[PDB]
């Protein structure tokens, strides 16, 4: 008799194909309903899973007063228990006394993973153009042959070496300084004062609503940019935004749980900052029925022992991810400077060969 | 039926002819071609009337009023008006517009990057010429002292080593500072580069729908640009574009103005380049009173033209005919030092001295 | 003249505290501090026979709109149990309407406490940062190999010229790479600057900054009409319960243990900075609310105290009293504040390495 | 309520005649922070006000010849002026004669000093990027290397050479990098940072206004940091002291100077002139306030009005309104400057010293 409303969400409620179609609750398989099954094994009761016909989320309507979404399946209290991805908003808390949230999270920014631009083993050749290097070699041969056939030539050679050292060091220092000045990522959670890396969120979603009703010095300018180019940055759904991020320089703003889910599904995306908003996901009941307190105490007794961590991991691992740097220093790498080692070894071995040849 | 056009230079001029003309089939331009194509495809015959009063649309926002070019040639004087203008709140509240035909946006005029690479440009640059003479005479003095002498050799070698270490460190450090200074500044200033810098000046037509977009729509970089423009109301602001092109032609100026005519200017004058792409979005259309008597025919014609593709080719040909040559084709600047040959020429001089 | 003057005070560490003595002590002798010194100066200027009577409510005056009743020092002043409430007690309109104050014996305001910018200065091996340790081992083995091959060639002059040239080129590349990397490392440090204003801290979002959950150091922001302060109040309101700590000491702990920039009255800020390092007052002064001495409305003492306070301001002994009670204890903990803008004092401890190489080369 | 007549000084940042003086003759004659403060007071408290300048254009100063007063306190004590809304500094000598409302603004002594620009001494131009201890350590290491080489000659063929090469390349790289960072960033800093820093030095002469608030405060200061300042000022009573204020500003603009002013006019000048800047924060903590005759009932309400203005933020609004006249022009876009003679000059002197030392020891060797 305990009807539980559900909504199909990629990391929360899934309709597994399995081998053959099933009927009832066994066909449905997802993190939320699995947690409900466990707490039903703990707290003794039955539950019947019911989906929402409309499939939309619950929010205040501009010209109706009544709310569409699960609220349509909640206005007449036809859903005894409501588990779904539901941010605890002001109006939702006003009308539903939501239990303690399962998760605490907020909107977070998503970005394409900054690939390491490897310039090859011969990276030390960059500061001076190769033509200048050929000039250096021809000058070396010229000064050597002139010396073969002494104060003036020695002084001019020393001055030339002076100039070459100075120029090479100046170019390399300028290149490394401009590389280090700009951060490999954008201004973390501070895409203001940038106006070049286009950023956007879902169209008229929870993130869009939050940015609309925000007055912080960074987020108000972010919302101004949102509204200025709404037809471009805003996307219909999460997958379209992810595809746009993959195909072009685009920063998305999505729920943090979805950000970690996606960035763990594939390692081509990263979460720059995180928790730039305060909200939570937890179940509730439209009426002040006494069993929501039982739900809260079930949540507390489930959290007092370690069981939700493992299910959260096994649900949000997906495939593996290659190791990535966390505290790499500013020191030159082997891949960045190994060219001089290689050329020195080659020069040494050819010198030995031509010495033993005669 | 009755239509109204605009007097702006980029879309139409006053074509010279002996026949008495007042704006009926005796002009030229892309707007004239658009109007004639619409009339022919829709079969509409009428008279075309020029601008009576107002430039770009007179605005009287002191009491929410607007008279010139907007309420004297669009609403009541003429039933319709194909006047090329942007769509904004003050117009679209009552004067409706068709779906956009071209997307208008402001981009930046800039000086074309010219590469000056003197042979002796950085060989004697970081060190002052007086310092160059000083180090030459110091070398001469230490050489003559060594000649006079030939222990003191250890101390003279040590002081020479200390001096040469300092002079190399100073020279290399100053060259690195110069390179860093010239490299931190963007090789081409973009929609965000101008805001963060102050050496390069930017401006546009005073309240010519450009800084109207800047006063509202508070974007961080855009707010910084608007503050900088308001700081210098004349120093960084130019009165129009007909002389703004000449101003930006030889100066450090940047001129913010719409994409179509900046493309026209860059094509007709390759000496100036365009940067930034559609940083703001604005659409074209036609004037329309309350009721839209002839919206159906114009919408049908423009959607048929969009599905036809004739607009794309007419746009390309008309806006490229003045710019058939393209001087800028493979613009690219090397990051490393190029043609720094002063050290090579002095090495050659030293070699031939012997 | 022959009447005891009852005064009240609260336990604020910089201002008034119980005298540090294991032996029990009673009366005015048991209280000591800056405000106690001020009261002693007032007593020795005017004619006072004063006894300190600690406020039982343990709070400052607050207009309780539930019943329209005061509390703490202000309410204690309304009924003349004590007629001189000398204490850290801000001059506010809600108080000044109901109670009567003298001139501000010191002016303060809201200011931001921020942890000093940590730098990678410590470490005698900081000169080896630009080149990775594996690269250093590669350099050492290349030096050993080139020495060995040169010795072999000598044992066994075009080849000598070639090996000399290749070694010179290798040294050229390695020294230029090291110089360039260390120059970039020391240039990006001077390139970035810490925030030293309220505008800079309000524009940013990474560095959290919030006031205390009960004091008036946030109530100014709530009623503030200035753009930047209103924006930062909106920011800290959007992230309440996380950047609005309950008490000052846990705010200091959070600042020490996190990228948190606390925000409270300037006197406490400078007291903390002099007493404890690692923290500085980055902002100058946001608000301005001087303290004062309590006084019942129908009491001439205020006026006289007014004059007395001004007397001290003319004598300059208020300045030295504040220095003694604020900076005097911080003298042992005075920060180095080196005048050298380079900040390169023994960054690279290569002298020790050179000495070790020399003594090993002595053989 | 009759009409309260206020007496006001003509201090520049606080009270100015209206720019259109020819057609204005009413209460709109005067404009300034004090004037619109009084306007806000009339908006918040019901009373009409008539502005009158003090006759002699002076502040209230005690006249010791007969015990009388000098300026606008004279008509306060005689009830000739109901209010004195003006920059009346709250002082003990005045408070015994008149009643001051609680300060609407707090000020004090501060150092006006020229904004640093491109300049650098000779030897310290290149000695700066390394600490003098590091230079002495380098010299000691060079001497040690020389004596170790002498011992080796008298008794490592290449090990000492290699370690010395490593040491010298590390030192040259560090020096080059540090001076490159200095040239790229160019983080200018004033020689003085606080009062004690200016007290210790003697190259930059001080400044004040003779028979002014600053000089009187410095006299009889008895503070260990300001008694030396008073002694230095007494050393040259004609040079460092300035008979006026604009004269002192011009002097500090046109020459090396460390003038001393009230913080309000300090910030007014620094926001009006980019060449100048403020040092020391606050030395004294003098407060302003409106003046009233003793026993005037309006003090207890005008202090309430001032506290309201300060709490609601309108005081800060009118403060920021008429002290940022144009803002600070910051460009930071000029750094392509070569090493001139001034930028690096000490190297010629040190090499000449080395040369003369070498020739002296050479001619002494023949002995
Ligand atoms: C790799 O990084 C570069 C540098 O920003 C940029 O082109 C882009 O983010 C990546 N390029 C790819 C994935 O082709
Ligand atoms: C080269 O470009 C610069 C930058 O505007 C300027 O000196 C000038 O426009 C050009 N110099 C010429 C044409 O000699
Ligand atoms: C040192 O720097 C680190 C940088 O991550 C930061 O924890 C803080 O600024 C400093 N911490 C301590 C304990 O000094
Ligand atoms: C400052 O931070 C350091 C680093 O954690 C710590 O050791 C020290 O106790 C702190 N306080 C000081 C130096 O007063
Ligand atoms: C730079 O400062 C010196 C300080 O003596 C001053 O004489 C000179 O006029 C200043 N130059 C400027 C501000 O251009
Ligand atoms: C003073 O005026 C401006 C403000 O900084 C400055 O550019 C100028 O060089 C200065 N001139 C003198 C003589 O100090």
Swiss-Prot record, chain A:
Cysteine pairs bridged by disulfides in the record: 267-321
Compartment(s) of residence: Cell membrane; Postsynaptic cell membrane
Consequence of substituting residue 140 to C: In RNA edited version
Residues annotated as binding L-glutamate: 85, 87, 92, 206-207, 255
Stretches in topological domain Extracellular: 177-336
Positions of transmembrane segments: 131-149, 156-176, 337-357
Residues of this chain annotated as glycosylated in UniProt: 115, 268
Tissue spec: Highest expression is found in the olfactory lobe, piriform cortex, dentate gyrus, hippocampus, granular cell layer of the cerebellum, and in caudate-putamen.
Effect of residue 268 to Q: Loss of glycosylation
Post-translational modification: Sumoylation mediates kainate receptor-mediated endocytosis and regulates synaptic transmission. Sumoylation is enhanced by PIAS3 and desumoylated by SENP1. Ubiquitinated. Ubiquitination regulates the GRIK2 levels at the synapse by leading kainate receptor degradation through proteasome.
Functional note: Ionotropic glutamate receptor that functions as a cation-permeable ligand-gated ion channel, gated by L-glutamate and the glutamatergic agonist kainic acid. L-glutamate acts as an excitatory neurotransmitter at many synapses in the central nervous system. Binding of the excitatory neurotransmitter L-glutamate induces a conformation change, leading to the opening of the cation channel, and thereby converts the chemical signal to an electrical impulse. The receptor then desensitizes rapidly and enters a transient inactive state, characterized by the presence of bound agonist.
Record-stated family: Belongs to the glutamate-gated ion channel (TC 1.A.10.1) family. GRIK2 subfamily.
Subunit note: Homotetramer and heterotetramer with GRIK5. Tetramers may be formed by the dimerization of dimers. Assembles into a kainate-gated homomeric channel that does not bind AMPA. Can form functional heteromeric receptors with GRIK4 and GRIK5. Can form functional heteromeric receptors with GRIK3. Interacts with DLG4. Interacts with NETO2. Interacts (via C-terminus) with KLHL17 (via kelch repeats); the interaction targets GRIK2 for degradation via ubiquitin-proteasome pathway.
Miscellaneous information on this protein: The postsynaptic actions of Glu are mediated by a variety of receptors that are named according to their selective agonists. This receptor binds domoate > kainate > quisqualate > glutamate. It does not bind AMPA without coexpression with GRIK5.
Protein name from the UniProt record: Glutamate receptor ionotropic, kainate 2
Species name: Rattus norvegicus (Rat)
Residue numbers of the full-length protein present here: 432 to 841 of 908
UniProtKB/Swiss-Prot annotation, chain D:
Name of the coding gene: Grik2
Misc. remarks from the entry: The postsynaptic actions of Glu are mediated by a variety of receptors that are named according to their selective agonists. This receptor binds domoate > kainate > quisqualate > glutamate. It does not bind AMPA without coexpression with GRIK5.
Residues the entry annotates as binding L-glutamate: 87, 89, 94, 213-214, 262
Annotated TM spans: 133-153, 163-183, 344-364
Glycosylation sites: 1, 117, 275
Subcellular localization, as worded in the UniProt entry: Cell membrane; Postsynaptic cell membrane
Impact reported for residue 142 to C: In RNA edited version
Record function comment: Ionotropic glutamate receptor that functions as a cation-permeable ligand-gated ion channel, gated by L-glutamate and the glutamatergic agonist kainic acid. L-glutamate acts as an excitatory neurotransmitter at many synapses in the central nervous system. Binding of the excitatory neurotransmitter L-glutamate induces a conformation change, leading to the opening of the cation channel, and thereby converts the chemical signal to an electrical impulse. The receptor then desensitizes rapidly and enters a transient inactive state, characterized by the presence of bound agonist.
Similarity-based family: Belongs to the glutamate-gated ion channel (TC 1.A.10.1) family. GRIK2 subfamily.
UniProt subunit comment: Homotetramer and heterotetramer with GRIK5. Tetramers may be formed by the dimerization of dimers. Assembles into a kainate-gated homomeric channel that does not bind AMPA. Can form functional heteromeric receptors with GRIK4 and GRIK5. Can form functional heteromeric receptors with GRIK3. Interacts with DLG4. Interacts with NETO2. Interacts (via C-terminus) with KLHL17 (via kelch repeats); the interaction targets GRIK2 for degradation via ubiquitin-proteasome pathway.
Tissue specificity as recorded in UniProt: Highest expression is found in the olfactory lobe, piriform cortex, dentate gyrus, hippocampus, granular cell layer of the cerebellum, and in caudate-putamen.
Listed name of the protein: Glutamate receptor ionotropic, kainate 2
Modifications made to the protein after synthesis: Sumoylation mediates kainate receptor-mediated endocytosis and regulates synaptic transmission. Sumoylation is enhanced by PIAS3 and desumoylated by SENP1.
Residues of the full protein shown: 430 to 843 of 908
Topology Extracellular: residue spans: 184-343
Cystine connections: 274-328
